[PDB]
Design a protein around this ligand. Structure first.
Ligand SMILES: [Zn+2]
Ligand SMILES: [Zn+2]
Lengths: 114, 193, 385, 209, 276, 230
RNA sequence: ACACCCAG
């Protein structure tokens, strides 16, 4: 889910098995640094790639003059009537033809997909 | 015939046989950029709030927009809204930036690309602000008396009503077709021209 | 010479008045385009919100593109049929399409009603810009105007966005013309230098340069393609009841034979028993005629290619001899059977008295003797011909 | 599996029994139209170490032209057949003095076994098949026309008629699936009857080389 | 549709939602919450399954939407693992009614490459080159009722008239003929393919010539243009004269027993004259 | 081929005599390692090697140059095979040795190929970023942006830049074309006036400069060109 | 040799 970096030689940690206690042990394999972690996860893979597109949409897209604007869908936590809607149109998104709405008010980067 | 040959490559004129599609011709208003020094633009950016590339840490890049001048990474910025409003105003006023210089903002990637080198192909377009042309009637009446007045196309560009837009800036422009239509009060297609 | 010099009197022309439609047709065309635009907008609205169920075999985006293209093609066909419905007989665009001299029905539809959807590389106009076909449209616009549909006609004039999309389909047709020609010319070269030495030898066996048999007879029948025509086999389509009715010479029902044959001919047919045995031998051979074609032709396609046009040279024989179809004939049915048997022995493709040669001769002209026995049977010659 | 294996064993038996009948070998009508539950009752229904074992479907048939010219049909147990197992079946053919035999191999043979099929080729004719290749009959396909193997006396009649040499005829490879089906060797000529949409029946001849 | 579900190649890339690997040594406690209920149910001393096994745990879950649209179960997957891998792997499956359809994989007990990357490497093998049900090199398979007699079957009734029925025809993507013909409830007479090479190596040399004539007539007569059968038969008999598919290129025409002078007029001019 | 999602950064310095140099950074197909195609080097090298050659040797500095935000694991996942490929190299000097051993001109001593590899790492690697002794942090940031553009396209986060887009094209008019001729033509004139002056000063006559320069190189070079089309 | 260009 995430790997920290070495405190001694600034390299990348890697999993290692120890027989003294049988606990997960992230060990840097360049130097001899040792570290015990608590996440207890090594590798996760999104096979159907259900990645939340709402986080990857940049909140500053709402001021693009080339994007359409409609007042039909108002902002949820902002209350502004008009907003900017678009499609992601990217790979690893299956159909990728469902609208994502971004509020156009300044200092409000709320994105909802409806 | 690619989609971005609009306005600066003729869609009709093309030779036949083995050469079809490869030998193209400029449009009527196409103006290939002659080239300029990137030193005044780089001097303006370092004078502004832009931080230098070696000055920053490799941790503030994620929440900032990279600045590209002639394809070279030169630093980052934290206020891209004010930078484009300043850069576009300075090109229209023709103060320090030559009118052939094209600045492109890729908001979905957070990149700013300023191109200055020769070889770019540009065409002139009018300027629309708040759904109104900046080309008022006083510009037409001055241009209708083009001689004995020392008023020409160069004074129209310096008045801030006509910009030169290349194909790469046309990715991020919303271009009105004709002022007779599409710029009035009806069922709205796009209110930000 | 005769037609052109009459054309000096009648004359023929084309003009603007051959493209103008009346006010009812233009209102009907504009109503269909407006309804089709509303249908596409409804589909896009049904596809933006997750309400469109994907058809099996393809993704949602290709399902959406198939549905939009189906509506726009139905729009072009409906506005096309509306435009040619209101064309007068004096219209000269119709005068050169129904004659097939030049042009087609889609050309009149493009001139009068709508140019139609314009495609580059199979699909519609792509997103050459960042998710836009042209800078004049909004981002992520899958509507008809933005993606290439031309709602105007040549007579009305194309809008500047539609003009540029027309220059794309026109260019793509020109790129296809140059690339296909350079490829097909190499296909043509390779295809024939491999077999330019293949020649029909004097023993009627197709052989190559090194004298290896490619085909035992040319085209498996020994007949050149110049003197063969499209014909119809009459004993492949009808059922068993219809075949027995229309192809068996009924030795009973003497009233019918009096209507079709003369008095001396019908007396010989009924009295003799050897003639009835021969006519029954014809029909049982015609049942094996049918069963062979059921094996050869499983799809029932009775349009085959054969040298002599049996249905036409019979019509030739009716006209040159002034044959009256109302009066009864004087042709003996056993003379027909002996005549067909003698004719079948007189047409040779594989010559020789060897049993191997006789088997190849029977197989080479098998399908022609199927058609010869079917068309020149006793029942059809006594009733129809 | 059990039901899938006993269906596969029944279907591969019906095809190879049709293979024997197409070669002119003495095959009764009962063995040709062997219904599935008739095979289940006669042999078994649990071939996974049960009554219908792999070495039980041995078929002995004889030529109609010559009674002492016979056939073996073999189903070896091992998925890969090797020199030692081949040498066992050679002793069985030496004991029962029958030359021609078929070995239906489930998952291919060793490269050494492949070279030993042709080692005693002019003494013992030993040709092979995969299990999936004999699982369905290929002659019954509509693309494959009805092949006929024609005797050497009829070949000499053919060459004297058309005044041809042996190499002037069209060719068919010995490794062709129809060629392996009929058990033809090099030098034989196969009479081939096809339906044509321009002449009817058309007969062409192919030599094995 | 049953023929569709069993001919089509189904892999774990099309049925699994997401996968993960963990470390939890004792089966009595795991980091994931909704697991320990049916883990203890399946570990009520299940003979060999509790042993000196390595602590590394592979936890993969399958999305219910694709699982219902493909109609499998955990029983079919379990013996597919036990046949593909044997006793080298231990598989534990959960109940069907659970929202999180969790499938658990562990490595065998007596196991120089470590298990932290062995379980990574075999997980890639499970989702790339493992077949759940179906036969390989088949990307998709379709269904459609025919309306024209190009693919429509035609029978002869008792009356003898040609009756055009409406059967179901499967069209695939990717070619593998030797096992589709081998499949139960599949017609072994009219089943064909557009691949010339596999027709030759499965059905013979006369079948590949008949198939050559079919696809060559289909590519030309689609436009409505007519070309006589004699020119079709002459090319198909020239290209299949020698018993192998004599491709019309330098690699097939310059390799036959003809004279060298029209070989060098064809292609390869200097190189043929060197060989001659 | 073996390359899926290749990269291209054809680069030339402003008013520099050297022509454009391509620095194709490619990802290998599944059959995910990132390799590079540095100029004046025969076969490909891993991208983490040239990062360690540039001066930044720790894996924290390399991934801070490439991966701008460490929160997302996806881009950190595809850079993992590249780090595993470059486990052998651990110093800057040995990274320079590996680059110089694969060069077009193989050196003799260890310091010979290190100096040659440092020359191509500095003067022919991204000349538009900068050609100077201390312009190496800017080069690695651009090489960090090299891989970051590659990882985004492999993830599909941004659309791949097609070649036929005409904003990705430039037009050489008579200006840049004639300046390209006058690049080497003035270089050829300065080369010959150097050997002519050296010939008259080796033996001690000194030289008259007005007769040292011939008006024949620039005149023929600009008249043979624009006429023959060469 | 190269460019340009005619016809399909
Ligand atoms: Zn460390
Ligand atoms: Zn808001």
């Amino acid at each position: 889910v995430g790997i920290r970096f070495c405190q001694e030689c600034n390299n990348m940690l890697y999993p290692k098995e120890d027989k003294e206690n049988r606990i997960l042990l992230y060990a840097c394999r360049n130097c001899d640094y040792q570290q015990e972690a608590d996440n207890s996860c090594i590798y996760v893979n999104k096979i159907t790639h259900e990645v939340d597109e709402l986080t990857q949409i940049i909140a500053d897209v709402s001021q693009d003059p080339t994007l359409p604007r409609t007042e039909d869908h108002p902002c949820q936590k902002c209350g502004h009537k008009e907003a900017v809607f678009f499609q992601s149109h990217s790979a690893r998104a299956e159909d990728a033809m469902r609208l994502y709405y971004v509020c156009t008010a300044p200092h409000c980067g709320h994105r909802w997909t409806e | 015939l690619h989609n971005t040959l609009w306005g600066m490559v003729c869609p009709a004129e093309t030779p036949e046989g083995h050469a079809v599609g490869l030998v193209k011709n400029l449009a009527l208003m196409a103006y290939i950029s002659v080239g300029s020094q990137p030193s005044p633009i780089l001097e303006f950016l370092e004078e502004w709030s832009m931080e230098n590339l070696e000055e920053i840490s490799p941790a503030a890049i994620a929440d900032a927009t990279k600045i590209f001048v002639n394809g070279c990474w030169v630093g980052i910025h934290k206020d891209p809204e004010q930078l484009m409003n300043t850069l576009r105003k300075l090109r229209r006023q023709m103060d320090i930036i030559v009118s052939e210089v094209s600045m492109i903002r890729d908001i979905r990637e957070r990149e700013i690309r300023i191109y200055t080198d020769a070889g770019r192909i540009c065409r002139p377009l009018l300027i629309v602000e708040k759904q109104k042309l900046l080309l008022k009637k006083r510009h037409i009446d001055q241009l209708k008396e083009r001689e004995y007045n020392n008023y020409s196309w160069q004074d129209l560009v310096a008045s801030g009503v006509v910009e030169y837009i290349d194909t790469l800036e046309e990715e991020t422009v919303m271009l009105a077709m004709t002022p007779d239509d599409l710029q009035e009060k009806e069922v709205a297609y796009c209110s930000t021209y | 010479t005769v037609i052109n010099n009459w054309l000096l009197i009648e004359g023929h022309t084309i003009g603007i008045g051959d493209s103008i439609a009346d006010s009812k047709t233009y209102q009907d065309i504009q109503n269909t385009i407006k309804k089709a635009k509303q249908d596409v907008i409804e589909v896009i609205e049904k596809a933006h919100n997750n309400e469109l169920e994907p058809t099996p075999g393809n993704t949602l985006r290709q399902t959406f593109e198939n549905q939009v293209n189906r509506i726009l093609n139905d729009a072009r066909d409906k506005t096309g049929s509306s435009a040619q419905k209101s064309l007068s007989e004096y219209n000269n665009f119709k005068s050169m399409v129904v004659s097939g001299a030049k042009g087609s029905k889609i050309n009149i539809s493009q001139v009068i009603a709508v140019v139609g959807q314009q495609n580059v590389e199979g699909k519609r106009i792509p997103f050459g810009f960042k998710h836009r076909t042209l800078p004049h449209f909004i981002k992520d616009d899958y509507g008809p105007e933005s993606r290439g549909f031309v709602e105007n006609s040549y007579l009305a004039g194309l809008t500047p966005t539609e003009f540029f999309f027309h220059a794309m389909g026109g260019r793509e047709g020109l790129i296809d013309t140059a690339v296909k020609t350079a490829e097909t010319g190499y296909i043509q070269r390779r295809l024939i230098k491999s077999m330019e030495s293949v020649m029909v030898k004097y023993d009627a066996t197709v052989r190559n340069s090194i004298n290896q048999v490619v085909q035992l007879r040319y085209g498996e029948d020994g007949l050149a393609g110049e003197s063969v025509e499209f014909q119809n086999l009459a004993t492949l389509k009808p059922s068993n009841k219809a075949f027995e009715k229309k192809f068996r010479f009924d030795y009973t029902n003497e009233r019918a034979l009096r209507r079709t044959l003369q008095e001396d001919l019908v007396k010989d047919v009924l009295s003799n028993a050897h003639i009835q045995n021969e006519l029954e031998r014809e029909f049982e051979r015609m049942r094996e005629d049918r069963e062979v074609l059921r094996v050869i032709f499983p799809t029932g396609d009775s349009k085959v290619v054969l040298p002599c046009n049996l249905l036409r040279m019979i019509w030739n024989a009716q006209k040159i001899f002034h044959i009256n179809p109302r009066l009864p004939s004087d042709l003996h049915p056993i003379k027909v059977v002996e005549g067909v048997k003698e004719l079948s022995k007189k047409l040779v493709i594989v010559n020789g008295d060897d049993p191997l040669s006789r088997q190849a001769q029977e197989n080479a002209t098998l399908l022609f003797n199927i058609h010869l026995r079917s068309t020149l049977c006793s029942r059809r010659m006594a009733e129809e011909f | 599996d059990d039901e899938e294996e006993t269906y596969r064993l029944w279907k591969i038996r019906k095809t190879i029994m049709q293979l024997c009948h197409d070669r002119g070998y003495l095959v009764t009508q009962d063995e040709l139209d062997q219904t599935l539950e008739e095979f289940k009752a006669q042999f078994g229904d649990k071939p996974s170490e049960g009554r219908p074992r792999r070495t039980d479907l041995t078929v002995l048939v004889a030529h109609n032209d010559d009674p002492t010219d016979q056939m073996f049909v073999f189903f070896p147990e091992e998925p890969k057949v090797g020199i030692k197992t081949i040498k066992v079946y050679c002793q069985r053919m030496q004991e029962e003095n029958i030359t021609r035999a078929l070995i239906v191999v489930q998952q291919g043979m060793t490269p050494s076994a492949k070279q030993s099929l042709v080692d005693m080729a002019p003494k013992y004719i030993l040709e092979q098949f995969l299990q999936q290749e004999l699982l369905i009959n290929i002659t019954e396909h509509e693309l494959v026309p009805e092949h006929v193997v024609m005797t050497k006396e009829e070949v000499t009649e053919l060459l004297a008629r058309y005044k041809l040499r042996e190499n002037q005829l069209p060719r068919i490879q010995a490794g062709d699936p129809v060629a392996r089906y009929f058990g033809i060797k090099r030098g034989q000529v196969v009479k081939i009857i096809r339906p044509s949409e321009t002449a009817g029946r058309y007969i062409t001849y192919r030599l094995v080389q | 549709k049953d023929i569709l579900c069993r001919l089509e190649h189904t892999t774990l890339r099309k049925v699994t939602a997401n996968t993960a690997i963990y470390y939890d040594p004792n089966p009595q406690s795991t980091v994931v919450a909704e697991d320990q209920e049916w883990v203890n149910v399946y570990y009520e001393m299940p003979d060999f399954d509790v042993a000196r096994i390595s602590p590394w745990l592979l936890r993969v879950e399958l999305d219910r939407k694709h699982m219902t649209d493909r109609k499998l179960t955990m029983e079919q997957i379990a013996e597919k693992i036990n046949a593909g891998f044997g006793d080298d792997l231990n598989c534990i499956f959960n109940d069907d009614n659970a929202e999180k359809l969790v499938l658990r994989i562990r490595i065998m007990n007596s196991d120089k490459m470590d298990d932290d990357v062995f379980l990574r490497c075999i997980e890639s093998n499970m989702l790339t080159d493992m077949t759940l049900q179906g036969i390989e090199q088949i990307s998709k398979v379709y269904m459609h009722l025919p309306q024209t007699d190009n693919k429509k079957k035609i029978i002869i009734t008792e009356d003898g008239e040609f009756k055009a029925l409406q059967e179901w025809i499967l069209e695939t993507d990717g070619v593998s003929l030797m096992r589709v013909l081998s499949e139960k409830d599949v017609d072994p007479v009219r089943t064909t393919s557009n691949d010339i090479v596999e027709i030759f190596t499965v059905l013979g040399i006369e079948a590949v010539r008949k198939a050559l004539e079919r696809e060559l007539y289909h590519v030309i007569s689609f436009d409505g243009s007519y070309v006589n059968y004699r020119h079709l038969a002459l090319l198909c008999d020239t290209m299949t004269c020698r018993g192998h598919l004599m491709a019309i290129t330098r690699h097939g025409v310059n390799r036959q027993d003809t004279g060298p002078l029209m070989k060098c007029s064809f292609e390869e001019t200097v190189d043929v004259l060197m060989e001659a | 081929s073996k390359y899926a999602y290749t990269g291209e950064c054809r680069s030339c310095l402003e008013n520099s005599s050297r022509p454009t140099s391509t620095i194709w950074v490619s990802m290998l197909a599944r059959g995910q390692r990132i390799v590079a195609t540095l100029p004046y080097i025969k076969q490909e090298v891993p991208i983490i090697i040239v990062f360690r050659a540039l001066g930044f040797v720790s894996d924290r500095d390399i991934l801070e140059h490439i991966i701008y935000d460490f929160e997302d694991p996806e881009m950190m996942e595809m850079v993992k095979p590249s780090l595993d490929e470059a486990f052998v190299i651990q110093e800057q000097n040995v990274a320079l040795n590996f680059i110089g051993s694969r060069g077009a001109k193989p050196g003799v001593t260890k310091e010979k190929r290190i100096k040659y590899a440092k020359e191509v790492l500095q003067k022919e690697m991204l000349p538009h970023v900068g050609v100077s002794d201390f312009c190496e942090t800017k080069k690695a940031y651009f090489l960090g942006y090299m891989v970051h553009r590659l990882l985004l396209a492999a993830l599909g986060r941004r659309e791949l830049d097609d070649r036929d887009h005409y904003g990705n094209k430039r037009l050489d008019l008579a200006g840049p074309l004639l300046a390209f001729l006058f690049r080497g033509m003035f270089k050829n004139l300065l080369k010959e006036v150097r050997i002519y002056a050296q010939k008259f000063i080796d033996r001690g006559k000194d030289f008259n400069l007005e007769l040292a320069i011939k008006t024949r190189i620039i005149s023929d070079g600009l008249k043979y060109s624009l006429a023959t089309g060469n």
